Write a protein that binds this DNA or RNA. Structure first.
Lengths: 103, 37, 127, 135, 143, 63
RNA sequence: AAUAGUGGUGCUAGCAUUUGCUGGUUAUCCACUUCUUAGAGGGACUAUCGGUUUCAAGCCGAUGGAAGUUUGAGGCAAUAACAGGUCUGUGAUGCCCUUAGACGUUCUGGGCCGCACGCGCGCUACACUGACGGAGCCAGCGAGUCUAACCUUGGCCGAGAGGUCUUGGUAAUCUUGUGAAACUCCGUCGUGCUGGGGAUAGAGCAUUGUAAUUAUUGCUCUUCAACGAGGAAUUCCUAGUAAGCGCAA
């Protein structure tokens, strides 16, 4: 019966809109109070490294990339409602977290 | 450390992975780095 | 006579105000660390010291010599044994005070031009 | 501003310890013509002199040429800090002084010749540089 | 017919204000104002012999006007120059702190700017009824 | 050091078309601040009909 | 959409005041998505008219349009003699001493670091479209602390350099609006190798580690020395492009 907050920061964007849909699905079949999935600015990683094992040759480089997407939802529910549904929305590559911060 | 492929120099100290860069191009796939641009 | 002081201030002044009459690096390199095994020359400098007539030879021990400050406890002593290959012949002259013990040994022979008649390099080339 | 017309009385040659000054310039630029004193040093002493900061040689009071070396020869007497000096904590006497034009060469050779020949208090491998490659 | 601080000149408004402060003389002016310049990057103590100490102290009040708070690190990273290094390329200036530490404390004695609970020194109703009122005294300089 | 800053300027001002620092440095004794203070005195004298002025330069003509 | 923002209602300070223009902050509360961020879609095809051509592929104008140079920029794509492709590649070479090893370490000074010329790809110039001094004051993509010292703001002392007391930040929240520089006004300066240009230097105070001499770097004051646009020659950089100006990893 406490306001909670869930985060999920994954790297397969197709496998994050199935999870964020079924989160808001079973909450709205029980019709709790909620606020929509707020989508944060994504983070990209990069490292320039030149493309030769030895050093003998012409010079330009590579650039590698890795994309991290992160979005989070706030929620309030009785604890018996939420403690079951957070255990049936598992999927590989996906991270789930629960925050009950009510300072 | 000197990891493998005749390298103790040019290590990638960033992002806490510590790989010799000769042996990064063949391992950058399965880490999950990919080139796009 | 650094500060206009008596230049015979040899045993009367300790190592502490020795640092006070000195520039800033050893004015930091004084509590820089309480050395024990690198304080092993001083336990062996007194093992052979001042038991001689005028003008002596100390008991040098193989060290890494180049790094310590000069002590007032020196007269003419020919410090330096083998500690590697580049030899460190360190005689004491008489009392020229406030310095490292490193600035005496062989580090580079000052050889002039062998065939340096191309002084640095060429000009823009043309044949 | 205005037209002030003085009767010349301007000295192409000055006499401040063998320094002959073309004094048709600003007086802080006049002192910089001597050695050992620059515009980072001469800046405050004319501000210590409490005069106009635009004058030429033809309008200077005659006591002030005595005054400017008097503040110079008594540097720490009239609030000059330690970081406003050239020669500081000497190896021979430990005191702190500044230098005029014709004596920067004093405390120069004798202080280098000990590092040149005598293998001095620090100069034993600082012993060939101004001797073999830069003599 | 009533103005804020925001609708006057920028350079000229300081000049008329500091000249009034030149008539005031109620400033702890330390002894070393002749020697110490503004930063390390500048080459010379300024061509102003006197009023520069009135100049910086006026404009620091002018900058806390629109702002919420000012510490000391901000006006260090403020003061309009480029560090020369000689033959090496340039770098940004950073300003000295002792000449700013006291002149921020030199306005608490006259009821202008004081410490916020958030952690910076800001104007309150002391200046907000007087510093604007003497900024309202600059409206006579508009004609 | 009394007449050269007294007759060619206090009498022979209105002879030209306009006035800038170019005409005043035609004497090799009138330096930069000396030429600068000339108009700085003459603006008080009212002969200058000003057109535009800023810190790098002015545009001044005579009466 | 309190990890973005405005719009009110307020507590609340100025207020010329008099209706008013600037503030006020946790939570004073409510209502909002235009700007912001990220998912889902849409939109441009050389469209439509006028020329031109074997009337063909197309190329030139035109008006519309966020966009009409493959719309701007990249990534990705195998024929070949460089016996440089070697990681516990093995050569899947039999002599390298290949077993008191001349392959390890700790434990040692000396590797790129010695006078009189460079083809080393611009760096700081040679100045009034300039220096110096006062002000005015604007950004983008990236980064970060637990078995542990990373970011660092106030209050601190001091001229910097720094030192001390605190916090804040596992990340749109904190550093950070990263108040960057050129440029911008107001001045001082006066064309001389002068205040342009600081190249070798001596005196000093600091920090980082086991240790800075042969200056590891940084702030003081001094000294100001080649250097007046460059002979013959010859260039990584394409319309928000060439050039300046950055000071983020």
């Amino acid at each position: 019966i406490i306001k909670i907050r869930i985060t999920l920061t994954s790297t397969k964007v197709k496998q994050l809109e199935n999870v964020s849909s079924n989160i808001v699905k079973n909450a709205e079949q029980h019709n709790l109070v909620k606020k929509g999935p707020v989508r944060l600015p994504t983070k990209v990683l990069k490292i320039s490294t030149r493309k030769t094992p030895n050093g003998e040759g012409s010079k330009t480089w590579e650039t590698y990339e890795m994309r991290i997407h992160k979005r989070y939802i706030d929620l309030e529910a009785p604890v018996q409602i939420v403690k079951r549904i957070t255990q049936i929305t598992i999927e590989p590559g996906v991270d789930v977290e629960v925050v009950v911060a009510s300072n | 450390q000197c990891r493998v492929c005749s390298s103790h120099t040019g290590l990638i100290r960033k992002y806490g992975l510590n790989i010799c860069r000769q042996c990064f191009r063949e391992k950058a796939n399965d880490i999950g780095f990919n080139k796009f641009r | 006579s650094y500060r206009g002081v008596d230049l015979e201030k040899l045993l009367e002044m300790s190592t502490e105000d020795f640092v006070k009459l000195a520039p800033a690096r050893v004015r930091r390199r004084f509590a820089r660390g309480m050395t024990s095994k690198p304080a092993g020359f001083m336990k062996k400098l007194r093992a052979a010291k001042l038991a001689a007539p005028e003008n002596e030879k100390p008991a040098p021990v193989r060290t890494h010599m180049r790094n310590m400050i000069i002590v007032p406890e020196m007269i003419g002593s020919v410090v330096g044994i083998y500690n590697g290959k580049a030899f460190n012949q360190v005689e004491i002259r008489p009392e020229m005070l406030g310095h490292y013990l490193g600035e005496f040994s062989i580090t580079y022979t000052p050889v002039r031009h062998g065939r340096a008649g191309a002084t640095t390099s060429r000009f823009i080339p043309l044949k | 501003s205005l037209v002030v017309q003085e009767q010349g009385s301007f000295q192409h040659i000055l006499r401040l310890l063998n320094t002959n000054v073309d004094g048709n310039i600003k007086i802080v630029y006049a002192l910089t013509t001597i050695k050992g004193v620059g515009r980072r040093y001469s800046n405050l002493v004319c501000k210590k002199a409490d005069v106009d900061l635009h004058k030429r040689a033809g309008e200077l009071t005659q006591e002030e040429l005595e005054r400017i070396v008097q503040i110079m020869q008594n540097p720490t007497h009239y609030k000059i800090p330690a970081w406003f000096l050239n020669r500081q904590n000497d190896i021979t006497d430990g005191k702190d002084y500044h230098t005029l034009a014709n004596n920067v060469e004093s405390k120069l050779r004798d202080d280098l010749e000990r590092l040149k020949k005598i293998r001095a208090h620090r100069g034993i491998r600082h012993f060939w540089g101004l001797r073999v490659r830069g003599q | 017919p009533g103005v804020s601080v925001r609708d006057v000149a920028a350079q000229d408004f300081i000049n008329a204000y500091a000249s009034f402060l030149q008539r005031q003389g109620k400033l702890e002016v330390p002894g070393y104002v002749d020697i110490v310049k503004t930063s390390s990057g500048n080459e010379m103590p300024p061509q102003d012999a006197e009023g520069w100490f009135y100049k910086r102290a006026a404009s620091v009040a002018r900058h806390i006007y629109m702002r919420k708070q000012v510490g000391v690190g901000k006006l260090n990273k403020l003061y309009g120059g480029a560090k020369s290094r000689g033959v090496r390329p340039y770098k940004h200036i950073d300003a000295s702190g002792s000449i700013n530490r006291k002149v921020l404390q030199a306005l608490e004695k006259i009821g202008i700017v004081e410490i916020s609970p958030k952690g910076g020194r800001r104007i309150s109703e002391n200046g907000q009824r007087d510093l604007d009122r003497i900024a309202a005294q600059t409206l006579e300089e508009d004609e | 050091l009394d007449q050269e800053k007294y007759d060619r300027i206090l009498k022979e001002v209105p002879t030209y078309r306009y006035v800038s620092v170019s005409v005043l440095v035609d004497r090799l004794k009138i330096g930069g601040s000396l030429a600068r203070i000339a108009l700085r005195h003459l603006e008080k004298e009212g002969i200058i009909k000003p057109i535009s002025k800023h810190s790098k330069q002015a545009i001044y003509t005579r009466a």
